[PDB]
């Protein structure tokens with residue numbers, strides 16, 4: 039039902055989402071709640087979309103998930119003005135998420151994935 043890589047990606051997801059208690063990054067931003075979003079942000083990302091990419095096996099590496107997570111936070115800091123709650127929340131989430139997605143945890147998880155293979 040899940041490969042070791044999928045299991046590892048799903049666990050990181052849960053860890054990252056716990057750093058978004060406001061649930062602002064849980065779901066895709068739409069043009070209705072953020073006017074002109076689709077004209078400014080060319081590659082949207084959110085936790086629910088990351089969740090489908092894992093289930094659909096779109097990720098070949100943990101680094102890909104980390105890139106998507108950074109994209110999530112980068113999009114929010116580009117679209118939202120610094121005085122907004124969403125900008126501040128993106129900065130807090132980026133800092134907390136990058137500690138979760140440290141080189142040491144990523145390398146540790148990659149070692150485990152290889153040990154569970156073949």
Ligand SMILES: CC(=O)c1cc(-c2cc(C(=O)NC3CC3)ccc2C)c2ncccn12
Nearest residue numbers: 061062063065066067071072114117118124
């Ligand atoms: C990531 C980001 O840029 C973003 C996220 C949201 C958003 C807000 C709420 C919410 O609860 N809003 C009420 C507190 C006022 C719920 C879910 C989402 C996806 C948002 N809304 C407008 C502009 C930007 N954003």
